[PDB]
Design a protein around this ligand. Sequence first.
Ligand SMILES: Nc1ncnc2c1ncn2[C@@H]1O[C@H](COP(=O)(O)OP(=O)(O)O)[C@@H](O)[C@H]1O
Ligand SMILES: Nc1ncnc2c1ncn2[C@@H]1O[C@H](COP(=O)(O)OP(=O)(O)O)[C@@H](O)[C@H]1O
Ligand SMILES: Nc1ncnc2c1ncn2[C@@H]1O[C@H](COP(=O)(O)OP(=O)(O)O)[C@@H](O)[C@H]1O
Ligand SMILES: [Mg+2]
Ligand SMILES: [Mg+2]
Ligand SMILES: [Mg+2]
Lengths: 49, 344, 165, 366, 359, 360
Amino acid sequence: KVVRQSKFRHVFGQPVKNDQCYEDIRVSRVTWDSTFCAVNPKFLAVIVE
Amino acid sequence: ASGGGAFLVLPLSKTGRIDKAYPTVCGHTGPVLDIDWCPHNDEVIASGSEDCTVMVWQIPENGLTSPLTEPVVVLEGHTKRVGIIAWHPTARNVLLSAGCDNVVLIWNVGTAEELYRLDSLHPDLIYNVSWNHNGSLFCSACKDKSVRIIDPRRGTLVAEREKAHEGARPMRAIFLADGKVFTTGFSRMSERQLALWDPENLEEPMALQELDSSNGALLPFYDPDTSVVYVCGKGDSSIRYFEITEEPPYIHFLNTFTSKEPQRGMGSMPKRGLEVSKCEIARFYKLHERKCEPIVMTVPRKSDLFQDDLYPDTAGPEAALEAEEWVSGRDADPILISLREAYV
Amino acid sequence: ASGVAVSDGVIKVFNDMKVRKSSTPEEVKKRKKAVLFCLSEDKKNIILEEGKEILVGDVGQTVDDPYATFVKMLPDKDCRYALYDATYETKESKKEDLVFIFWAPESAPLKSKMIYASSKDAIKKKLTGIKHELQANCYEEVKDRCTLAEKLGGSAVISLEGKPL
Amino acid sequence: AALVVDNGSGMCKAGFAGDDAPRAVFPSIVGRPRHQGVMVKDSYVGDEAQSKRGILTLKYPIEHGIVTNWDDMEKIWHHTFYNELRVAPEEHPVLLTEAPLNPKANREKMTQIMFETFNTPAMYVAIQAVLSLYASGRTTGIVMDSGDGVTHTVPIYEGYALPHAILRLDLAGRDLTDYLMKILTERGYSFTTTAEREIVRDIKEKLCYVALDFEQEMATAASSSSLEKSYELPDGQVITIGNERFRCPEALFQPSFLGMESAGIHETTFNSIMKCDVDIRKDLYANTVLSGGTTMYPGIADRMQKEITALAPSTMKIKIIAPPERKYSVWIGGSILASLSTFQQMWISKQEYDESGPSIVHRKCF
Amino acid sequence: AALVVDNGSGMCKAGFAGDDAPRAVFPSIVGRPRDSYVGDEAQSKRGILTLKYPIEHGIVTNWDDMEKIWHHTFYNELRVAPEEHPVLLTEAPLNPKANREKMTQIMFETFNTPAMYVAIQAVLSLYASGRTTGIVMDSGDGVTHTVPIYEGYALPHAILRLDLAGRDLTDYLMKILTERGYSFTTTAEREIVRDIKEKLCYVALDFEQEMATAASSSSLEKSYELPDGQVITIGNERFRCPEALFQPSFLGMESAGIHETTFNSIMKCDVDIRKDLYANTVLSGGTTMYPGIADRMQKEITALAPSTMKIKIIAPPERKYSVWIGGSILASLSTFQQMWISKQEYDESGPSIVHRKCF
Amino acid sequence: AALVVDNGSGMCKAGFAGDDAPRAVFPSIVGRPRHDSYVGDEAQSKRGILTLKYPIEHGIVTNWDDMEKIWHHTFYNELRVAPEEHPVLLTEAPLNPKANREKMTQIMFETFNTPAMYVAIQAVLSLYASGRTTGIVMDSGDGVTHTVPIYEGYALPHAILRLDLAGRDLTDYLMKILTERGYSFTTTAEREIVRDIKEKLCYVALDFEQEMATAASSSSLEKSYELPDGQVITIGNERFRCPEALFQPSFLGMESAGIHETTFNSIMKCDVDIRKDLYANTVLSGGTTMYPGIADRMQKEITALAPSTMKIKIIAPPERKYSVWIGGSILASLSTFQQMWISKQEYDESGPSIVHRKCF
Ligand SMILES: Nc1ncnc2c1ncn2[C@@H]1O[C@H](COP(=O)(O)OP(=O)(O)O)[C@@H](O)[C@H]1O
Ligand SMILES: Nc1ncnc2c1ncn2[C@@H]1O[C@H](COP(=O)(O)OP(=O)(O)O)[C@@H](O)[C@H]1O
Ligand SMILES: Nc1ncnc2c1ncn2[C@@H]1O[C@H](COP(=O)(O)OP(=O)(O)O)[C@@H](O)[C@H]1O
Ligand SMILES: [Mg+2]
Ligand SMILES: [Mg+2]
Ligand SMILES: [Mg+2]
C-alpha cells in the first residue's frame, strides 16, 4: 500500500566491459534523428560515414 | 565468512583462544543457517544455507588441517533458503530438510535420493521441525500460528491445532518421548508462554504458563532421559528448565540459571558425551558474540557413586533401521546403551 | 634522571665506532666490534670498562662468533651498557648497524640496577644514531642469537655474522 | 504516517513524519541487575534503566558509532516501537539514519532486522549529515555533527556529497564525559560506576561551556570565584566545580588532553574543506553547520568562528550556522524528507527486499 | 644528608638518603576528639577520637592535616630539623599541578627546607626494578594505580585508578572473620586483623579448586595468637580476603579486578608499545606482598592477552618499599645535588619552579 | 668510492657505487615525541610515542630542516661515512624545479662539504638498470607517479605526464576502507601498520568486477595479518580494492585517468615514428609497481588502448623497487661518467649556474 506494487522498481543499468564493446566505428553524422542502430540476436547494424 | 558461508568445526579439546586463520568448512556460496551432527556418525554433519542447498560433510578424526570446501554429497532440492535440518532419530542416512519455500523434503544422503516431497501442507513460513520418538511422525511450527503433526511416508496430516499461540512472534514445537507436543509461543499481549499438547485431544492444552513480556523466540531443549525441557531465549541472559510429568499442571518450573550476558545461540551435548561421574545431566554451550562458554548442569548428590535413577539407558550411536527399511513402513525404537561404562 | 654524565672517552669511542673512515687495513682490524660501558668508582660518569672490548681483527682468528663471546663478557651480577656492531643480512640487503644493549640482570644489586636505569635515557641521547635497543633483564634474553635477530629485523633477518639463523 | 528513527550512540530520537520535534527522546542504554533479589525483568531499556540505575549496570550498545552487541540493539528498537512510540512497526514505514561512510555490513544488519524481526512494510536509510542540512534549508555547506560516539565533517556542495573529503574524529560526548571524571577526581569527587556516568554526563550538560580564550579563562578562574558553580547530587550532596567547566569541552579543540594525536574539531573542519575542490571552498566557509548534542555548549559557535578564521585566508568570510534546535537537526531533517512528495520513490518494500536481498538497499542510497 | 618521605595513602614512609630501609613507618591519620593526634599516637587512644585520612587516596585533600603529618614526620619520627636537610617528596600519579605547587609552597615557607624535589612514586618503582619502559601496578593502602611508563615518562591518558587496596581487604577480612564466631569491630581489633592479613593471607592460583581443598581437609588451617593470649584459627579466609582484588564483586564493587585493570591500561596505550608493557609488568606496594600474587597475575593476564605475546610479571622481593628505596638512592647520589630545588630558585620563580625542573 | 643516494618520498636508499643492492634502505620519516627527534628506523621502532611526519609530500619539500636530518642520517648513521670524502650522486624527479635542485646542491656543498656531486633524473637511471636506451618509464613511488618516454637516449619533456596518485594515496585509501570492516587506524603510527599491510597482502586483480564476485561468494581470497600488539585481523576484497585506485582514480574522488591511460597518453604525445618502440619497452619502476599481477593488468589495459598491430610488452624486472638506485650505481661506475662530476671548488666560484647546465 505504501509502495506501488511492481517488479522493476530496482532495475539498474550496467555498461558492459571494454573488451566486449565495439571500437573504431565511424558513427554517422547525419542530423536526422533516428536510432542509428539496429540489432538482432545474430548481427549488429550501425549507420556509418 | 567474508564471502559465502562457513561454520567452524573444532575438537572439544581445542579450548582457549582460537586462531583467526583456523580452517573452516567453507563450501556454501551463501551464509549457512543451520547445522546438525549425524546421530549415528560422529564425523558427519549436514548444513543448510542461503544458497538453497544442503551439504553433507565428512570431518577428519583430528579435525580440519586445511579449509574444507568439497562435501561428500551436494543435496539440491529447494528453491529458497534452507534453515531447518533434522536427522532421522532411528533411520540411518535419512535427513529432513525444510526451506522457506514451504516444502518439507526427506532425503537419502547415502544415495543422494529424495525419498519424499511434502509441499502442500504448510501455507506459510516454517519455524522448526522435530521428529517424534521413533521417527514415525514430526511436528511443525508455521507462521500462521498452526501446529501440525505430519506423517512423512504417507504424506498425510495426522492432526492440526490452529492458533496454538495468539501472538504474531515466532513460536516453536517439539516432540516429547511420551508422544506429546511441547510448544513455546507468544500471547495476544506479547507475553511468552509454554504449552503442552495431546495429539489425540487438541481442543485445549493441558498447560498454559506465561513467563514474561520479553522479546525473542524461545528455543526448547528436551532431554528424554530426565524429561526436563530447557527453555533458552534468543537474546536472553537466563536459562529456564521445566520438568514434564503426568500430574497437574504437567509443567513444573524447577529453577533458573541467570547470567549477565545475552546469548546468541545455544548448543546441548548429547547424553553420550557428559561427565557421567560428576552427576552432570546437561551440558550447554552458550554462544556469545565472540565466545562459546560451556555451562554445566549438575544434580547435587552427596554420594560419589553412580546414580542409577538419574541415568537411564539412552539412545546410542548405532541405527536400528536403514533408509530402505523405513521407507517400506517399518518402525523401531532407537537402541538404548548403558552410561555405566563411562564411569571413571 | 640521576644526573650521571657521559665521559668524553665513551663519546670518542662512539664516534670512532659509528663513522667508518677510509683507513689502511691494519687500522681496520683495530675497529671496535663490541665495547662495554660501566659507572666510575664515584658513580658520576659513564666510563669505558677497560679490557672488555672486541675488535674487528679478532673476529675470525681468535673469535669465532663475536656475539657469544660478547655475552660472556657481561657480568652475572652487575649492570652494564653495551655497544655491539651487528653485521646481518636481510632478504634484500646486507646491513651493518650498531646495537645499544642494556644488561640489567635480576641478580644484580638493587643500587646498581637503579642507577643504570635512571641514567639510560641520558647516555642514549648523547649517543645519537643508534636505532636498535635491546633491554635484557636476564641471561636467557641476551644469549640467544635469534633474540638479537628479532630486534634487528623481526622475521626478515636471514643471517647474522655471516651464519644462518 | 511514516516513522523517523534516529539511533545515536547515546540518545535515540523517534517520532512521526511531519512533526517538528521528536516524540520520544530516551538514552540508548541497557541495564542489567548486578545484585541478587531477595524479595519474591532481567534487563531495562531507556528511561526505566535510568531511574533504577542504582542497582543496574548500564551498557551502551553503540560505542564509537559501531554496534558492539546487536542483541541489546534490538531491545533499543523494540522499546522504541512498542513502549515509547506505542505503534505497530508492521504498519508504518520507517525512515532510518546512518553515520557517514557507514560500513555496508552495518547497514545490511540494520535493514534485515527491520524487515525480518519487526516486519516493517517499507524502509529507507539516509546519511545523518544530509538530514542536518535539510533542517537548515540549505543545499551547500559542510556539516560537522558531534554526537555521543564520533564526530563527522561532511562537505556537501549543491546537493552533491564529497565522500573523499569526509573526515572522522574519534572524540565525542562520551569521551568528554569520561574526561570530566578524570579531572573531577582532582577536586576530590570520585565517580567510577556506570551509574555515576549519567550523573557526570548531566553535570556536563548543565555547567560546561566553551571559553573564547582558554588561557585567559584559566587566569580568571585561578584568581576569582565568579566562574564557580554548584550542582546537587541525587543524594542531596552539593559539589562545586571551577575551571573544570571549560576544561572538559576544551578537549574538542585540543585532543592532546586525552592523549590523542588527532587535531581538534576546528582543524578537522578546516582540513575537510581543504580536501575539496578550490572553486567550492568559498561557499563551505560561509555555510558551516553544527549538529549534534556535543555542539550545544555555550560559546562553542564563537570559538569555532575565531579558530577557523585564524586558519582560513583573510579574504574568506567565516559563518558558523548554529540553529538553537541543532540537538535534533538530524531528526528534524528526517521528518522533512519523509514528508516531501518527491521521497515516496525512495521507499524500499519488504516484498522487494525478500526477492532481491540487500543489493537494492546498497543502491538507492549513498 | 637528604630526607626521603614517601607520602602513601595509609602509611607514611620516611628515612635518610642512602639507607636501605625507611626509618619511620607510621599511619598517616589525624585524631580529633569525638586535641590533635597524629600517627600511632592517634591510634593508641583507639575509639575516643575520630580518625581522618588527609591523603586517603594518594591525592592530598586537606592540607591543614597534611602539614601536621609532615611536622610529626620531621620532629617526632625522623627527629631532625627540616631546615637543615633537603627533602625529597613522592607524589601520586595524576597529581594535579595545583597540589604540586602547594607542596612546594609548604615545604619552603613552613619548614624552611634548604632544598626540595618531587618525584612520581610509580617512576621510582620502575627505576628500582632496572627498567625505563614498563607498566607499574602500585597497589597501596587506599588506592591501586596502574601506571604505564615509556622511557621514564608516564602516559597520563593511560593511567587507571582503582579504589581497592589494603584498607578494603582489611575491612573485608573483618567482615568474613565474623562468620567463624570471632568479633573484630573496634579500632584496636582492626590493627590485629591487619596483622593477621599480613602474616597468613595468600593468593590461591585456582580459587574454586582451593575451596574444595579447604572444605575437605584442615591442611590450610592456621593458628594466630591474639595480644591477650587467646588463639584463633582461620581456614578458607586465608585466600578469600586477597581474592577480592581479582573479584571486586565480593566487596559489592562493580569495577574490574586488578588483573583486568592492568590489561585495560595497557590497551589504552599505543599499539606499538603494548608488546614491551606485557613483558615488563612490575609489582609495587604493600598489597602486592601476598605469596602467590605473581603467578596468579601471570595466569589471569595471559587469559586476556593474545596467545602470541609473552606475559612476564616482575615481583622483586623488596617491592613493598621500592618507592622509598628508589627515592633514597636518588637523593644519595652526588650528581643529584644539582637537581635539588634551591631556596634561591624558589624565591625567584615562586612555587611554579617545580613544573619546569621536577617535571 | 662514490655514494649513490636516491631520495624518495617514503624510502631513502643509499649505498656505494659498484654495488648491486642498496646498503641502507630506511623510511624517510621524522618523528617527534608527543608525550628531541627521531629519523628513519629509529623513529620506526619508537613510533609508539612519536608523531611521524614525512619531509617530502608529493615530491615537494615541505620542511628543509627535516630534510637535512634525513641526509645527516644517511651519511653518519646509516652509511657511516664522511660526506666530505666521497662523491655523492643524487637523484631527482622528472621536471624537477630549478629551485628544488638548487637547494639540494646548496645543502650538499655547504652543509656536508661533499667534494663532488651530480644530479640525475630518476627515470633515466631506471632505464640503465634494465639495459635499454629506448622506452617509456612509469616510475610510481610514494608521492607522485610519472611517465617519461625515452627514445635512443633522448628525453622528451613535452610528453612527460605526472599523476598525483601514488603509494601514500593508496595507504590512505586502505585506512578509509579498513574502517568499513571494523578496524580503525587514525594515528601516524598506525599509518605504517597499514602500509605494512599493503606491502604484504595487496595485489592487482586481472579483472576487478569478477574479483568482487568471488570475494562476495567465497572465502578463498581472505588473508590474516598480525598486528604488533597481537590481535589478528582479516581482510577480504580490500586486498585488491586498494591497488585498484591506480587504474580507477575515481575511487579517491580524483578526476584524472588511471596509470594505464596516463602511460598511453604519454605515448600518444610522442612522435608517430617512435610510438611502436615505446609500446614494446614499457618499463615499470618504483615500489608502487611491486603488486603481484600489476604487469598482467598493465598489459591487458594498454593493449585495449593501443592499436591491434602493436606489441605491448610490459617490462617488470623483479628488482624494480631499486631500479633507480641500481641504475645510479652503474652510472657512478662507468668510465664515461667522470666528466659529469661537479667539483666543490667549481661551485663556490660559479654557483648553481653550472648545475642547471650539465644536467637535464
Ligand atoms: N546541552 C548540552 N550541553 C552539552 N552537551 C550535551 C548537551 N545535550 C547533550 N549533550 C551531549 O551530547 C551527547 C550526544 O547527544 P546526541 O547529539 O543526541 O548524540 P547522538 O547523535 O549519538 O544521539 C550526549 O552524550 C550528551 O552528553
Ligand atoms: N606482608 C604483607 N602482606 C599483605 N599485605 C601487606 C603486607 N605488608 C603490608 N601490607 C598492606 O599494604 C598496605 C600499605 O602498603 P603501602 O604500599 O606502604 O601503602 P601506601 O603506599 O598507600 O602507604 C597496608 O594496608 C597493609 O595492609
Ligand atoms: N611489495 C610491495 N607491494 C606493494 N607496495 C609496496 C611494496 N613495497 C613498497 N611498496 C610501496 O611503494 C611506495 C614507494 O616506494 P618507493 O618506490 O621506495 O618510493 P620512493 O621512490 O618515493 O622511494 C611505499 O609507500 C610502499 O608502500
Ligand atoms: Mg547523531
Ligand atoms: Mg604507595
Ligand atoms: Mg622513486
